Amino acid sequence: ELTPEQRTLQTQARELAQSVFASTAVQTDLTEQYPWDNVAQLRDAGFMGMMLPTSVGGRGLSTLDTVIVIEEMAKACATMGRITVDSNLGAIGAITKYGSEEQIKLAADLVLAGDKPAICISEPNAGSAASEMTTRADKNGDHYILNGEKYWITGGGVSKLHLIFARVFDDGVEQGIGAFITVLDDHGPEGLKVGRRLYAMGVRGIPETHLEFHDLKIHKSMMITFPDGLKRGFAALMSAYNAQRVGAGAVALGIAQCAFEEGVAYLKRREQFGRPLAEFQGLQWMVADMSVQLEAARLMLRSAAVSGETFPDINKAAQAKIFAAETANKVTNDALQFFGSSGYGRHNPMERHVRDARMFTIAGGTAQILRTQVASKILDMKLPQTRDGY
Amino acid sequence: ELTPEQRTLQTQARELAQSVFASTAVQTDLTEQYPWDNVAQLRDAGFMGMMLPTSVGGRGLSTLDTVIVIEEMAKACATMGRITVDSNLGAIGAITKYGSEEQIKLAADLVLAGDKPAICISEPNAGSAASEMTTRADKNGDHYILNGEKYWITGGGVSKLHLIFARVFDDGVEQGIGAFITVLDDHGPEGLKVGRRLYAMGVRGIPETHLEFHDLKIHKSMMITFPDGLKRGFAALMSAYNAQRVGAGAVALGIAQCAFEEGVAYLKRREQFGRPLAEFQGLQWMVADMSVQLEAARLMLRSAAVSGETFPDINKAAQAKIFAAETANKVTNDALQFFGSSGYGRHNPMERHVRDARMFTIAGGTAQILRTQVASKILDMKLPQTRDGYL
Amino acid sequence: ELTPEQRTLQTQARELAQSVFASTAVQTDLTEQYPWDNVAQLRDAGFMGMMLPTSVGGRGLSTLDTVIVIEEMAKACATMGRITVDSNLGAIGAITKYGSEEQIKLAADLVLAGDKPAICISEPNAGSAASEMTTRADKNGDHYILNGEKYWITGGGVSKLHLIFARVFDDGVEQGIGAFITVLDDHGPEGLKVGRRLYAMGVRGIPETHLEFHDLKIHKSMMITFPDGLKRGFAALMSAYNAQRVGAGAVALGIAQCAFEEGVAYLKRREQFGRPLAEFQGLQWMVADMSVQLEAARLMLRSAAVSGETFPDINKAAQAKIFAAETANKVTNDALQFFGSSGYGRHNPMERHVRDARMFTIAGGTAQILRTQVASKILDMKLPQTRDGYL
Amino acid sequence: ELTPEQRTLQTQARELAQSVFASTAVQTDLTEQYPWDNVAQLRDAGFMGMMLPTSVGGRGLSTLDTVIVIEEMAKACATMGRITVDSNLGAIGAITKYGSEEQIKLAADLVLAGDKPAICISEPNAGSAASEMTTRADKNGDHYILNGEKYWITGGGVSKLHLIFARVFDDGVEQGIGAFITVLDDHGPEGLKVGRRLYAMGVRGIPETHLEFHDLKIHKSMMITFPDGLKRGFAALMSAYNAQRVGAGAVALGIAQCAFEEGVAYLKRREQFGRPLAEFQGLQWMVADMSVQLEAARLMLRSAAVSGETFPDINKAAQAKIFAAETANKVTNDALQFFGSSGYGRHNPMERHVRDARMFTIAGGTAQILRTQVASKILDMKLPQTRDGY
Ligand SMILES: Cc1cc2nc3c(=O)[nH]c(=O)nc-3n(C[C@H](O)[C@H](O)[C@H](O)COP(=O)(O)OP(=O)(O)OC[C@H]3O[C@@H](n4cnc5c(N)ncnc54)[C@H](O)[C@@H]3O)c2cc1C
Ligand SMILES: Cc1cc2nc3c(=O)[nH]c(=O)nc-3n(C[C@H](O)[C@H](O)[C@H](O)COP(=O)(O)OP(=O)(O)OC[C@H]3O[C@@H](n4cnc5c(N)ncnc54)[C@H](O)[C@@H]3O)c2cc1C
Ligand SMILES: Cc1cc2nc3c(=O)[nH]c(=O)nc-3n(C[C@H](O)[C@H](O)[C@H](O)COP(=O)(O)OP(=O)(O)OC[C@H]3O[C@@H](n4cnc5c(N)ncnc54)[C@H](O)[C@@H]3O)c2cc1C
Ligand SMILES: Cc1cc2nc3c(=O)[nH]c(=O)nc-3n(C[C@H](O)[C@H](O)[C@H](O)COP(=O)(O)OP(=O)(O)OC[C@H]3O[C@@H](n4cnc5c(N)ncnc54)[C@H](O)[C@@H]3O)c2cc1C
């Protein structure tokens, strides 16, 4: 259960979400435009960069704290939910833990001022097999020259801070995969080019784009550097996604919780056969089932949030994300069902919840990849996926 | 299994669907516009009014014949699938079976000319409890005067032939629920007004609208009349809907079958970890599960199509529609999953398949109402839904 | 997560369960005999009456403490699991909280000496509708005279302490449902008769019996009495059952956890096609699914255990029991599947796990009745089940 | 739908099942003894060896015919269901199609006289990977000498006709896997030894045993011989199991149909809260769901039954068996649930239905193996399961 302090934080997040964000969710989905007005208020209320240390102007809060807040934001608007995830977990967490003092201040100043960082890993031919990426960074003096292409970049065209993963070469000699920090300004940098938008089924208020690097010049001071090498550093950087996974799970949970509350209210108001739909036992049991799965999902995510060291344990986070994301797909569809034909109408928000929830078994590591991860832990086995793995 | 003649019919439907309709499905979803040119080609290829008797210029085909055709159309475009349903089953079937010679000719001439009839039953405050409808038909001489409002009317603003269900009153005295034929054109009729469009999650190429009746005047020769009471006639009219349900189940099935085929093809061409996704056993079993459920759904629908007398048996139809629609929701979602992030992009058709499939556990009697229907048969009892049902 | 002290308690429970109980589970299922020697060891290790206050010789532990212990016992033997539930939660909790000093001492002395109390509520014609019970308690001076019949009484013929629920009448006038304490020994009491044994699919090591009352005479000092009415007291008594439900959910979970562990171990040692079954991705994902659901169930149960005041919150308890029991039915069946044909042989414990797990969606309030309970909370309304409930 | 002739056959099977077999099912499960009395009447009513050609005294009926009959038998008693499968499909089908005139008459005379043949393939270390079997047959003159061990032999100790699969060696040179016919008599043959009984969760009325061969001498005339070789013959012999799979599916379906009918009757008779349980919508929808899955299962099996040439198409049969067996596990458990605590009692038959149904996702090819088979057809791919398959 939550501490008094956590309850206060939850209430503050709920108040902003309900009083400001909830009434914007339809228009944000309709226009597919980044809600700058909401982001400013998310910032002003202290909900961006929450886990940044107080030494750089952060609140020094926990993963659990952010998950509590994320769920409240997502209940109002899926876009605001994901904005809250990206401005608190993931790239910013990786920079916070492995970044130089300089890199941390840069990233913190941007996030605390309202930037939602973009992480740039995935490519058209490199998804679940991320290490197959072709984006490369070639050494040139005290700089690295980046060439390549990413896609489905959440925040493409609106994010300023970018964390880019690239295969690193020193004078033609492959060093491994490294991460590079760059800042998209109204002016530069030269060679960081936003590409075409990938219009999506849901969470449409955040642009997802291709992203290209044409001789993008990055100083070595903006490469995340590791003493024991890049190959070990890249795995260390990946551990940041364990936190982002729990946050993403909390967005799916928030969407589902919203749909559930709306469906339950509708069952009590809507009448057929002379009585509220709530009086029909078949629907009552559907409500019960949604409630049970939602509670389990919340427990899985909050439990995962406090596991591990700096980041959630990889297997607890994987278990919770599988569960939350599948829960959200079932709950949003069944809540839509409570509305009947009105649920199929775009003038009601139920079909949007289904569209919004659907990405969470996919993005950031698919439910399938997560199942393999969980199995590798239970079976205490490496589970190589290549033809010659065994 | 299918007859030789049915295989030919299936292949001719597939031919039109794949050569003409498939390349239009994305744009139809984008524009949300009724695909008039496609409808002309559906008509010209002989796939509208197929069960109409040959005497009025129909092909005299069976329910099974139509569901075979519908699944092929729906594999190409969900909108063309539903158009094929409404122009072959439901309202047109009710008229074909219970209509007078004059009513059948009127309806046949319109459908064979390319009209997709609209059926007008549901109201904002009367959906599952269709018997609580407030749309009213008051006898006035040899006419009935209609007042009321329907909604989610498929074809609102593009359909010409309408079949409107209303509570019938004679001198204030309720007679039962009756069905009234009218034809919308640019001239009239007076008092038939197309209301607002209800924009939808999917199958966006047919407009769904509110529909208002303001002293709409219908002659008694355009009412479907039964020699012994509307109270048994309404039940008879709703049997024509057993046929519509199998057709709608076939649309859901076609959508899912398309998604399945696309998903399977993607697994074989897409590589990660140095090999096609098809080589992963977890995905192989997902593929097997989809195939098993698709096959079952297809059997359920065809079995229902040949059941009953004039129309499919109400309970076999309900069972098949439950099964097919739930199958489609699972298969379209799982096929989308095979595509990864690309599956979430609207530049691919997988997210549309999910949106399209989702209406079929809802329209024409929800999966919940169908479960109650099937239970009433198995338990062999009336299952009243009112508070005083058992008193 | 668990406290250091709770980890020690868990490990001590595991120690007893694995070193002593695990090797007896097969034989307990074969004989269907109450495992007296095992019960003595459960007692001597301090795992009976754990929530009893220290003043009467208990350990004063929490609900969470008990569910941690119960899951360990159930992993070894379902019978020892249920024995641990009944000797820590439910009847003994009702008495501990609402009993007089005299009643608590009587009950505490019996439990700490190794007695597993029986709770006596359900009747052949009154299960889910517990409020329709026909077992009757008629006031006669300072006594109540009990007449009636219970069944599926866990511990029938071996339990000494009984807590019997009966409809209370004073001069023919119904007062509500009340709870009455009695102790069965070889001497008496007169009119308490153990009826026939109901042989069961699983958890066969505790006898389940009919129980008859024939003018069973109970002094009013052995009735659980409430300062303001049985009509609120019965509701209070049934709150003690919220605790029993979490315990029973923990038994279901322990059974499933055991089956899971055995299944996983088998996959790693069993080879077909030249390699361990563990290397097949289809089975790897089955393993992942089981783990995810087990983890959720464990969280649900522990969350419920710390909810509420004296006893777990009725709705968190209902939710957790729904989840845990359904999880166990799926996990035990799927773990059995990992064994192939060996899993169907009674010389392996997998088929027993399925049989054992299956009671937990039924006993103490079925999964259906629990769904209604949870719905009543979410919808915040009474959900009467009678024909006239809404009139 | 069924033809008039098929309906008549169905009625005749139902009449025997209901008037004779149904009242025996509890005792057969309780004693775990082979019901000789029922078998005699199954024989006398013409329900054994139904697909044997009329030239050898059979009825020349179809796979669909047998599936219709099997379901009716299984509705009365799971044991009688499996007896009907084994005396009509499987080993007897393989002998009927690939056997010599001599082998066919032998097998037909035995089955028509009431023998339930035993097929002997599986071994402790050879299950899904059946070709890994170690039972061997070594050439010796005009005979073969068999040594090895099988298990889970359905009919061990009561079956007379045995069809044994063994790895064949000619003077030490491996020839492939072949099938051998032998007949267990009260006297011989020497070296055919019934082993220990494997007591089972359900379908307890048929003994499942280990089986051993100690220098079991079989004349070459009782080996099933193929002109194009054993390696191609063994695959041909396997095709017989496609028919047995559909029959086994019909047993699972029959068990489930029985449980469903009993559950529905109980909902109408049992009252709580002043009314029949049948009036509760939650249960009504459970009934509806069972009905839908049962109908689909029946269609899948009957459709599979008429597919293929001599035997059902391997993929249609695999699809139908997966479906029927999983359907039966869900339906029997939910029907048990309708009975409440009484359902858990062994004095009612509901817990037996669950135990009986459970074997059918396992025996004769597990649901997992069948999923791989179905996938291999959809993907048009061989799906090798060995480490070096790719
Ligand atoms: C809304 C959205 C936002 C995104 N935002 C970002 C972002 O900001 N930054 C970024 O870098 N990326 C982003 N992505 C990309 C996403 O994280 C990756 O694409 C993800 O890894 C999925 O990869 P993929 O699409 O190539 O799937 P694939 O790897 O091609 O997989 C396709 C299918 O095959 C399955 N599969 C793959 N491999 C295996 C295997 N060995 N066994 C079994 N099954 C298997 C998958 O589960 C999936 O079902 C985003 C994606 C979405 C949808
Ligand atoms: C895409 C689309 C096209 C349509 N086209 C047409 C058309 O052309 N002509 C026409 O007349 N109508 C049409 N409809 C309307 C549709 O057929 C009806 O609206 C349908 O009966 C559902 O009605 P409802 O939305 O009012 O649901 P409601 O009756 O309000 O029900 C809402 C929810 O409560 C449930 N429910 C209701 N009653 C009960 C009960 N007694 N027990 C348990 N659960 C219950 C429902 O299953 C549903 O989940 C269309 C609808 C859609 C979505
Ligand atoms: C192993 C075991 C041990 C037990 N130990 C004890 C014990 O020690 N003490 C004791 O008092 N009892 C005990 N019981 C009895 C058990 O708690 C009750 O019997 C239970 O309440 C179920 O009652 P029932 O079997 O009469 O079900 P019924 O009430 O007859 O219900 C039968 C079916 O109808 C459903 N149903 C009923 N009512 C409704 C409704 N309004 N809406 C929807 N569905 C509905 C039920 O969910 C169930 O599926 C035990 C039972 C078992 C199996
Ligand atoms: C009631 C009963 C009656 C029987 N009667 C007979 C009979 O009369 N004659 C006879 O010859 N045999 C008989 N058998 C044996 C049965 O047909 C075989 O044992 C069956 O092939 C299962 O093999 P197995 O137990 O060794 O499972 P295994 O092959 O060891 O498999 C164990 C588990 O791993 C899975 N598995 C295996 N391989 C793979 C893979 N590549 N990918 C994914 N998953 C996998 C399986 O699905 C299963 O879940 C009977 C069995 C039973 C239960």
PDB file of C-alpha atoms in Angstrom, chain D residues 191-328:
ATOM      1  CA  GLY D 191       8.321 -63.715 -24.901  1.00  0.00           C
ATOM      2  CA  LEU D 192       5.337 -61.361 -25.186  1.00  0.00           C
ATOM      3  CA  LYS D 193       5.148 -60.174 -21.563  1.00  0.00           C
ATOM      4  CA  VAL D 194       2.576 -57.783 -20.130  1.00  0.00           C
ATOM      5  CA  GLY D 195       4.310 -55.512 -17.627  1.00  0.00           C
ATOM      6  CA  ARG D 196       3.202 -53.375 -14.700  1.00  0.00           C
ATOM      7  CA  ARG D 197      -0.019 -51.363 -14.835  1.00  0.00           C
ATOM      8  CA  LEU D 198       0.195 -47.601 -15.103  1.00  0.00           C
ATOM      9  CA  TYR D 199      -2.707 -46.419 -12.974  1.00  0.00           C
ATOM     10  CA  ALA D 200      -4.198 -43.294 -14.509  1.00  0.00           C
ATOM     11  CA  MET D 201      -5.981 -40.095 -13.655  1.00  0.00           C
ATOM     12  CA  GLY D 202      -8.989 -41.126 -15.749  1.00  0.00           C
ATOM     13  CA  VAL D 203     -10.496 -43.472 -18.350  1.00  0.00           C
ATOM     14  CA  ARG D 204      -9.600 -46.053 -15.713  1.00  0.00           C
ATOM     15  CA  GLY D 205     -11.645 -48.921 -17.114  1.00  0.00           C
ATOM     16  CA  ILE D 206      -8.946 -49.792 -19.653  1.00  0.00           C
ATOM     17  CA  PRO D 207      -5.631 -51.140 -18.376  1.00  0.00           C
ATOM     18  CA  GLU D 208      -2.622 -49.130 -19.528  1.00  0.00           C
ATOM     19  CA  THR D 209       0.534 -51.235 -19.104  1.00  0.00           C
ATOM     20  CA  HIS D 210       4.201 -51.644 -19.813  1.00  0.00           C
ATOM     21  CA  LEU D 211       4.840 -54.340 -22.408  1.00  0.00           C
ATOM     22  CA  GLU D 212       8.053 -56.282 -23.006  1.00  0.00           C
ATOM     23  CA  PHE D 213       9.421 -58.537 -25.724  1.00  0.00           C
ATOM     24  CA  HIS D 214      11.970 -61.198 -24.758  1.00  0.00           C
ATOM     25  CA  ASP D 215      13.141 -62.913 -27.931  1.00  0.00           C
ATOM     26  CA  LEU D 216       9.579 -62.702 -29.209  1.00  0.00           C
ATOM     27  CA  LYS D 217       9.560 -64.714 -32.421  1.00  0.00           C
ATOM     28  CA  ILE D 218       7.457 -63.326 -35.280  1.00  0.00           C
ATOM     29  CA  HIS D 219       7.214 -64.974 -38.702  1.00  0.00           C
ATOM     30  CA  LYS D 220       7.916 -62.633 -41.626  1.00  0.00           C
ATOM     31  CA  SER D 221       4.348 -63.247 -42.814  1.00  0.00           C
ATOM     32  CA  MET D 222       3.182 -61.198 -39.803  1.00  0.00           C
ATOM     33  CA  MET D 223       5.416 -58.238 -40.578  1.00  0.00           C
ATOM     34  CA  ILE D 224       3.656 -55.511 -42.537  1.00  0.00           C
ATOM     35  CA  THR D 225       5.699 -55.399 -45.743  1.00  0.00           C
ATOM     36  CA  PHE D 226       6.144 -52.562 -48.232  1.00  0.00           C
ATOM     37  CA  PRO D 227       7.466 -52.798 -51.811  1.00  0.00           C
ATOM     38  CA  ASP D 228       9.145 -49.373 -51.719  1.00  0.00           C
ATOM     39  CA  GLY D 229      10.787 -49.930 -48.325  1.00  0.00           C
ATOM     40  CA  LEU D 230      10.249 -49.591 -44.570  1.00  0.00           C
ATOM     41  CA  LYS D 231      11.292 -45.960 -44.277  1.00  0.00           C
ATOM     42  CA  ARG D 232       8.460 -44.935 -46.593  1.00  0.00           C
ATOM     43  CA  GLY D 233       6.176 -47.560 -45.059  1.00  0.00           C
ATOM     44  CA  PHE D 234       6.581 -46.236 -41.529  1.00  0.00           C
ATOM     45  CA  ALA D 235       5.291 -42.835 -42.633  1.00  0.00           C
ATOM     46  CA  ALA D 236       2.441 -44.610 -44.434  1.00  0.00           C
ATOM     47  CA  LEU D 237       1.600 -46.526 -41.248  1.00  0.00           C
ATOM     48  CA  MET D 238       1.614 -43.270 -39.262  1.00  0.00           C
ATOM     49  CA  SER D 239      -1.145 -41.954 -41.535  1.00  0.00           C
ATOM     50  CA  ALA D 240      -3.491 -44.441 -39.838  1.00  0.00           C
ATOM     51  CA  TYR D 241      -3.204 -42.325 -36.654  1.00  0.00           C
ATOM     52  CA  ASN D 242      -4.933 -39.469 -38.485  1.00  0.00           C
ATOM     53  CA  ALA D 243      -8.141 -41.453 -38.232  1.00  0.00           C
ATOM     54  CA  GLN D 244      -7.500 -42.494 -34.656  1.00  0.00           C
ATOM     55  CA  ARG D 245      -6.948 -38.828 -33.788  1.00  0.00           C
ATOM     56  CA  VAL D 246     -10.407 -37.828 -34.945  1.00  0.00           C
ATOM     57  CA  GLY D 247     -11.905 -40.759 -33.038  1.00  0.00           C
ATOM     58  CA  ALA D 248     -10.011 -39.763 -29.890  1.00  0.00           C
ATOM     59  CA  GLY D 249     -11.311 -36.247 -30.400  1.00  0.00           C
ATOM     60  CA  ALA D 250     -14.832 -37.636 -30.543  1.00  0.00           C
ATOM     61  CA  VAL D 251     -14.319 -39.323 -27.175  1.00  0.00           C
ATOM     62  CA  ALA D 252     -13.278 -36.017 -25.588  1.00  0.00           C
ATOM     63  CA  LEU D 253     -16.296 -34.410 -27.250  1.00  0.00           C
ATOM     64  CA  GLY D 254     -18.605 -37.134 -25.942  1.00  0.00           C
ATOM     65  CA  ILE D 255     -17.320 -36.769 -22.380  1.00  0.00           C
ATOM     66  CA  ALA D 256     -17.840 -32.986 -22.582  1.00  0.00           C
ATOM     67  CA  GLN D 257     -21.290 -33.339 -24.145  1.00  0.00           C
ATOM     68  CA  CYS D 258     -22.263 -35.660 -21.294  1.00  0.00           C
ATOM     69  CA  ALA D 259     -20.981 -33.229 -18.641  1.00  0.00           C
ATOM     70  CA  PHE D 260     -22.743 -30.331 -20.382  1.00  0.00           C
ATOM     71  CA  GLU D 261     -26.102 -32.130 -20.485  1.00  0.00           C
ATOM     72  CA  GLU D 262     -25.836 -33.068 -16.816  1.00  0.00           C
ATOM     73  CA  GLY D 263     -24.848 -29.526 -15.849  1.00  0.00           C
ATOM     74  CA  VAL D 264     -27.746 -28.028 -17.785  1.00  0.00           C
ATOM     75  CA  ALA D 265     -30.228 -30.443 -16.173  1.00  0.00           C
ATOM     76  CA  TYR D 266     -28.805 -29.555 -12.756  1.00  0.00           C
ATOM     77  CA  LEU D 267     -29.158 -25.782 -13.314  1.00  0.00           C
ATOM     78  CA  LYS D 268     -32.845 -26.358 -13.983  1.00  0.00           C
ATOM     79  CA  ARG D 269     -33.442 -28.576 -10.932  1.00  0.00           C
ATOM     80  CA  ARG D 270     -31.186 -27.016  -8.285  1.00  0.00           C
ATOM     81  CA  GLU D 271     -32.551 -23.937  -6.508  1.00  0.00           C
ATOM     82  CA  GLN D 272     -30.855 -21.192  -4.488  1.00  0.00           C
ATOM     83  CA  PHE D 273     -32.308 -17.786  -3.495  1.00  0.00           C
ATOM     84  CA  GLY D 274     -35.789 -19.190  -4.114  1.00  0.00           C
ATOM     85  CA  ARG D 275     -35.254 -20.105  -7.759  1.00  0.00           C
ATOM     86  CA  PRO D 276     -33.579 -22.471 -10.254  1.00  0.00           C
ATOM     87  CA  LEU D 277     -29.906 -21.698 -10.894  1.00  0.00           C
ATOM     88  CA  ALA D 278     -30.884 -21.543 -14.576  1.00  0.00           C
ATOM     89  CA  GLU D 279     -32.373 -18.099 -13.933  1.00  0.00           C
ATOM     90  CA  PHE D 280     -28.974 -16.531 -13.193  1.00  0.00           C
ATOM     91  CA  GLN D 281     -27.521 -14.725 -16.219  1.00  0.00           C
ATOM     92  CA  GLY D 282     -23.898 -15.395 -15.304  1.00  0.00           C
ATOM     93  CA  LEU D 283     -24.541 -19.128 -15.471  1.00  0.00           C
ATOM     94  CA  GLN D 284     -26.704 -18.710 -18.586  1.00  0.00           C
ATOM     95  CA  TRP D 285     -23.761 -17.167 -20.403  1.00  0.00           C
ATOM     96  CA  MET D 286     -21.491 -19.979 -19.197  1.00  0.00           C
ATOM     97  CA  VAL D 287     -23.991 -22.441 -20.691  1.00  0.00           C
ATOM     98  CA  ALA D 288     -24.043 -20.464 -23.934  1.00  0.00           C
ATOM     99  CA  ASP D 289     -20.236 -20.542 -24.153  1.00  0.00           C
ATOM    100  CA  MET D 290     -20.115 -24.290 -23.605  1.00  0.00           C
ATOM    101  CA  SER D 291     -22.756 -24.806 -26.308  1.00  0.00           C
ATOM    102  CA  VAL D 292     -20.850 -22.685 -28.826  1.00  0.00           C
ATOM    103  CA  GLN D 293     -17.528 -24.465 -28.258  1.00  0.00           C
ATOM    104  CA  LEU D 294     -19.175 -27.908 -28.322  1.00  0.00           C
ATOM    105  CA  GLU D 295     -20.898 -27.232 -31.653  1.00  0.00           C
ATOM    106  CA  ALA D 296     -17.649 -25.927 -33.182  1.00  0.00           C
ATOM    107  CA  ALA D 297     -15.807 -29.013 -31.914  1.00  0.00           C
ATOM    108  CA  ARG D 298     -18.373 -31.371 -33.429  1.00  0.00           C
ATOM    109  CA  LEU D 299     -18.133 -29.576 -36.791  1.00  0.00           C
ATOM    110  CA  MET D 300     -14.296 -29.669 -36.731  1.00  0.00           C
ATOM    111  CA  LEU D 301     -14.245 -33.414 -36.045  1.00  0.00           C
ATOM    112  CA  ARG D 302     -16.948 -34.357 -38.551  1.00  0.00           C
ATOM    113  CA  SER D 303     -15.301 -32.141 -41.182  1.00  0.00           C
ATOM    114  CA  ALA D 304     -11.911 -33.731 -40.501  1.00  0.00           C
ATOM    115  CA  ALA D 305     -13.547 -37.167 -40.712  1.00  0.00           C
ATOM    116  CA  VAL D 306     -14.524 -36.729 -44.376  1.00  0.00           C
ATOM    117  CA  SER D 307     -11.283 -35.063 -45.460  1.00  0.00           C
ATOM    118  CA  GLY D 308      -8.336 -36.926 -47.012  1.00  0.00           C
ATOM    119  CA  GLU D 309      -8.236 -40.250 -48.876  1.00  0.00           C
ATOM    120  CA  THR D 310      -8.362 -43.449 -46.841  1.00  0.00           C
ATOM    121  CA  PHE D 311      -7.559 -41.452 -43.712  1.00  0.00           C
ATOM    122  CA  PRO D 312      -8.407 -37.897 -42.613  1.00  0.00           C
ATOM    123  CA  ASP D 313      -6.100 -35.152 -43.819  1.00  0.00           C
ATOM    124  CA  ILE D 314      -3.317 -34.902 -41.252  1.00  0.00           C
ATOM    125  CA  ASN D 315      -3.708 -31.146 -40.700  1.00  0.00           C
ATOM    126  CA  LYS D 316      -7.511 -31.114 -40.542  1.00  0.00           C
ATOM    127  CA  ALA D 317      -7.374 -33.978 -38.035  1.00  0.00           C
ATOM    128  CA  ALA D 318      -4.677 -32.165 -36.013  1.00  0.00           C
ATOM    129  CA  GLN D 319      -6.741 -28.944 -35.967  1.00  0.00           C
ATOM    130  CA  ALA D 320      -9.896 -30.798 -34.894  1.00  0.00           C
ATOM    131  CA  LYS D 321      -8.101 -32.766 -32.156  1.00  0.00           C
ATOM    132  CA  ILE D 322      -6.470 -29.671 -30.672  1.00  0.00           C
ATOM    133  CA  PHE D 323      -9.868 -28.026 -30.645  1.00  0.00           C
ATOM    134  CA  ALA D 324     -11.974 -30.923 -29.319  1.00  0.00           C
ATOM    135  CA  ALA D 325      -9.500 -31.817 -26.574  1.00  0.00           C
ATOM    136  CA  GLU D 326      -9.104 -28.271 -25.300  1.00  0.00           C
ATOM    137  CA  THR D 327     -12.860 -27.754 -25.556  1.00  0.00           C
ATOM    138  CA  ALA D 328     -13.438 -30.856 -23.433  1.00  0.00           C
TER     139      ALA D 328
END
